[PDB]
Amino acid sequence: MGFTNLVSLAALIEKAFPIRYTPAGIPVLDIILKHESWQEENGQQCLVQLEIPARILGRQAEEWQYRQGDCATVEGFLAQKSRRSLMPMLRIQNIKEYKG
């Protein structure tokens, strides 16, 4: 019975840091997302720019670690990288190649 935290973003993976691992083994993949669209607002269209760090886990973190040059649809939730951080990050639950 959750409180809604849903982002879907289509965006080019701009940078993908070498893959890493929790002490427990799980694959962790840090990423920078560069987004760039025209959205509707109060009647007119808007150039939107957005660069946002993001993180992928486990299986998809390995299938995707090699894809710096690519455009993806991404679904997840927003969170602050590290308590006391004042900076939000996207925690990806699912990641397709954009074909929208």
Asked whether 81 and 24 are in contact (CB, 8 A), the reply is no
Q: How far apart are CA 87 and CA 80, in angstroms?
A: 5
Which residues of this chain interact with a copy of itself, rule CB under 8 A?
1-11, 26, 35-42, 48-52, 57-58, 73, 77-80, 83, 86-88, 91, 93, 98, 100
> What is the 8-class DSSP label of residue 24?
T
Least Cα distance to 65 among 23, 20, 96 occurs for: 20
Between 21 and 88, name the residue whose CB sits nearer to a copy of itself: 88
Q: Name the minimum Å distance from CB 17 to a copy of itself.
A: 17
The nearest distance, CB 66 to a copy of itself, in angstroms, is 21
The least CB distance from residue 25 to a copy of itself, in Å, is 12
Report the length, in residues, of the chain: 100
